Enzyme design. Structure first.
Site, PDB file in Angstrom:
ATOM      1  N   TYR A   1      -2.583  -4.572   3.356  1.00  0.00           N
ATOM      2  CA  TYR A   1      -3.356  -5.809   3.363  1.00  0.00           C
ATOM      3  C   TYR A   1      -3.161  -6.588   2.078  1.00  0.00           C
ATOM      4  O   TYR A   1      -3.448  -7.778   2.039  1.00  0.00           O
ATOM      5  CB  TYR A   1      -4.840  -5.528   3.552  1.00  0.00           C
ATOM      6  CG  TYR A   1      -5.241  -5.064   4.938  1.00  0.00           C
ATOM      7  CD1 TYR A   1      -4.366  -5.142   6.009  1.00  0.00           C
ATOM      8  CD2 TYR A   1      -6.504  -4.538   5.167  1.00  0.00           C
ATOM      9  CE1 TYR A   1      -4.730  -4.708   7.263  1.00  0.00           C
ATOM     10  CE2 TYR A   1      -6.883  -4.109   6.418  1.00  0.00           C
ATOM     11  CZ  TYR A   1      -5.994  -4.188   7.468  1.00  0.00           C
ATOM     12  OH  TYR A   1      -6.370  -3.727   8.721  1.00  0.00           O
TER      13      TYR A   1
ATOM     14  N   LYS B   1       0.385   9.143   7.839  1.00  0.00           N
ATOM     15  CA  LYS B   1       1.497   9.196   8.772  1.00  0.00           C
ATOM     16  C   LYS B   1       2.646   9.885   8.084  1.00  0.00           C
ATOM     17  O   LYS B   1       3.733   9.344   8.024  1.00  0.00           O
ATOM     18  CB  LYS B   1       1.920   7.795   9.203  1.00  0.00           C
ATOM     19  CG  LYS B   1       2.836   7.796  10.408  1.00  0.00           C
ATOM     20  CD  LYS B   1       2.281   8.709  11.493  1.00  0.00           C
ATOM     21  CE  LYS B   1       3.035   8.550  12.797  1.00  0.00           C
ATOM     22  NZ  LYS B   1       3.095   9.846  13.506  1.00  0.00           N
TER      23      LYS B   1
ATOM     24  N   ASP C   1      -2.167   8.840  14.659  1.00  0.00           N
ATOM     25  CA  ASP C   1      -2.074   8.766  16.110  1.00  0.00           C
ATOM     26  C   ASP C   1      -2.912   9.877  16.749  1.00  0.00           C
ATOM     27  O   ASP C   1      -3.696   9.593  17.662  1.00  0.00           O
ATOM     28  CB  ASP C   1      -0.606   8.820  16.566  1.00  0.00           C
ATOM     29  CG  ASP C   1       0.213   9.856  15.809  1.00  0.00           C
ATOM     30  OD1 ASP C   1       0.594   9.613  14.651  1.00  0.00           O
ATOM     31  OD2 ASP C   1       0.521  10.914  16.386  1.00  0.00           O
TER      32      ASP C   1
ATOM     33  N   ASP D   1      -9.421   0.872   8.753  1.00  0.00           N
ATOM     34  CA  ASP D   1      -9.902  -0.273   9.503  1.00  0.00           C
ATOM     35  C   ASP D   1      -9.890  -0.008  11.007  1.00  0.00           C
ATOM     36  O   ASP D   1     -10.886  -0.161  11.694  1.00  0.00           O
ATOM     37  CB  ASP D   1      -9.024  -1.470   9.169  1.00  0.00           C
ATOM     38  CG  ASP D   1      -9.713  -2.787   9.401  1.00  0.00           C
ATOM     39  OD1 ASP D   1     -10.941  -2.800   9.622  1.00  0.00           O
ATOM     40  OD2 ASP D   1      -9.023  -3.817   9.375  1.00  0.00           O
TER      41      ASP D   1
ATOM     42  N   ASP E   1     -13.402   1.094  13.194  1.00  0.00           N
ATOM     43  CA  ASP E   1     -13.769   0.291  14.338  1.00  0.00           C
ATOM     44  C   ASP E   1     -13.788   1.123  15.591  1.00  0.00           C
ATOM     45  O   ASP E   1     -14.701   1.030  16.387  1.00  0.00           O
ATOM     46  CB  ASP E   1     -12.811  -0.891  14.465  1.00  0.00           C
ATOM     47  CG  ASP E   1     -13.197  -2.037  13.543  1.00  0.00           C
ATOM     48  OD1 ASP E   1     -14.272  -1.957  12.917  1.00  0.00           O
ATOM     49  OD2 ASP E   1     -12.453  -3.035  13.457  1.00  0.00           O
TER      50      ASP E   1
END
Lengths: 345, 345
Positions: free
Chosen positions: A139, A185, A217, A241, A245
């Site tokens: 970001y 990851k 994942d 994020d 959520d």
């Protein structure tokens, strides 16, 4: 115990006092030495002062030990240059205190499994704290650009960035069930590899907390199939994020959710919901997220874990016996708050 | 209709013939002109030929119109240099045909809502096709590195990469319910912005298909709260990895899932499950994913949408009346296949 209270906009004044009523009750019962002052912030400060985070308020959060924050913003101020939007006042606040971890818990309160999108057997006992890195990653990473032909963004992490946010996850875990799952990851990405080896090294100073590593994942799938298995989850900015959520839909009602942000400065505890200005002053606003923000403040800002838990139980019970309108009930702000206090006694 | 059949390892020979039995039955009823040949691939080819993708097989997929692929790999070959691992043979295959989109559908078959982790009312009617870009994005992007101090990876997309995979989503949608949701992070990232404007421009050539854009954090939440609302979803490589895996838990049984990969070359249709060598030759392997791979081949490789749908209904019904052991039933491979054929008639 010095708290700066920033009520905000819409239903902010109502739900934030509902939380203060609860903090005062504990202050009286336990002698916590609560001292607080209320400061202008958000839309009201724009209207009063011309800006969302005026100097008395900045001064006030600087001197406090925690900030209890109501809701901010509303259509009233949607038409502003964003140098003075409510949204931007929120950013300056977290920026001014260097808060680099976002704490977002999702919890299916017993008997509220019916609200879950998940089957009752899977929803039961869910209580997961996602720790999101706030200041770094893709970001914010450079180089970044866009072309006629291509666009690019860089997921980049320095060791110190990975170190801070991991330390807050381990300390949070210490207060809960002492299991941390770090999410990366690492099987495809350098950044994943680097994150993982760093958190593994940080974990050596916290022998009392269990550490486990998962890919993003897989953690996504666990949060739907077996979300009751998690305690604390820590991960980078974009993953955290997504996973915040995702975890937030598990309880089935977003109005119930609190949020904290921790860093070098004064910590900020706030409900996840918005101003809901339409109902401001009707006395029907659900104070649950604000009261659970106050419990988060006790736990994370002051270390009063047993009290935070006492407050959380009072609202678990209140939610069952006097459900607010948005849980199908008829309890206004005050009637609900009163039920909480009944169980605080 | 020229199909190269690559049975593979473990239960691959069993479930792949179960699919061929179904393809032959349709060939007979409809005169499809099915012509197929079976080639060595995976562990068996290593044992026979010394490599996982020998030249006759490469030749054979080159000349075919579709590849129907069973399962590959097993502990037998876990100890190999990965220049000749089964896994790598899978990569060369998809690389040799330049397959740049991965198609992964998740579908709650009517009456199988009980398997879902989701409440029955939310699981009902779920049928979502995730279209994952395969060759690009952060998994492959440069610059990338790792330091004592930091690590970095680059999410990078060129217009042509975004264009191909969007075209396959629109064409897939054309065959289904004609709604595409493109998933990006356009509110924070250049790459998100670039992806979105590109897919919006591609969409102009497909007036008959509806297009909608969502952020990855929101789509994650929709897939748990309202996953029946989706038809086709298209997104980049890492997002599509997360969202594929997330969507795959919705039906509640991974053994049911097929997979296709499309590109410039010969398309590959394969079950998502593994070799399950332990049960190879017992006649109990669930052929559902293989048969639904064959339906995917009809639809995507040959355009025979109505037949693919006829096959999908035959197995929806077979799953209810003769459930395989892993759905609590007692139907072996052959008994299940026979039930499918009964409804194909």
């Amino acid at each position: 115990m010095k708290v700066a209270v920033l009520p905000g906009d819409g239903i902010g004044p109502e739900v934030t006092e509902a939380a203060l009523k609860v903090l005062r009750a504990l202050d009286e019962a336990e002698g916590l030495g609560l001292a607080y002052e209320v400061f202008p912030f958000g839309g009201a400060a724009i209207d009063a002062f011309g800006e969302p985070f005026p100097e008395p308020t900045r001064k006030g959060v600087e001197e406090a030990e925690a900030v209890l924050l109501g809701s901010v913003g509303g259509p009233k101020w949607d038409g502003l240059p964003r140098k003075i939007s409510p949204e931007t006042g929120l950013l300056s606040l977290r920026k001014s205190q260097d808060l680099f971890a976002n704490l977002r818990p999702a919890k299916v309160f017993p008997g509220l499994e019916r609200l879950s999108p998940l089957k009752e057997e899977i929803a039961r006992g869910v209580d997961v704290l996602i720790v999101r890195e706030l200041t770094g990653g893709i970001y914010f990473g450079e180089p970044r650009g866009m072309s006629e032909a291509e666009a690019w963004n860089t997921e980049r992490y320095s060791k110190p960035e990975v170190e801070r946010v991991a330390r807050v996850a381990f300390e949070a875990a210490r207060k809960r069930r002492k299991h941390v799952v770090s999410v990366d990851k690492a099987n495809v990405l350098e950044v994943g590899e680097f994150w993982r080896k760093t958190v593994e090294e940080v974990g050596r100073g916290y022998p009392d907390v269990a550490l486990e590593h998962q890919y993003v994942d897989a953690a996504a799938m666990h949060l739907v199939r077996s979300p009751a298995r998690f305690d604390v989850v820590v991960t980078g900015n974009i993953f955290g994020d997504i996973l915040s959520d995702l975890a937030s839909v598990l309880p089935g009602s977003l109005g119930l959710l609190p949020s904290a942000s921790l860093g070098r400065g004064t910590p900020v505890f706030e409900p996840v919901h918005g101003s809901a200005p339409d109902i401001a002053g009707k006395g029907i606003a659900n104070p649950t997220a604000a009261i659970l923000s106050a419990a988060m403040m006790l736990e994370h800002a002051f270390g009063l874990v047993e009290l935070a838990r006492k407050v959380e139980d009072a609202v678990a019970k209140a939610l069952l016996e006097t459900p607010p309108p948005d849980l199908g009930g008829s309890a206004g702000t005050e009637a609900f708050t009163a039920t909480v206090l009944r169980h605080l006694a």
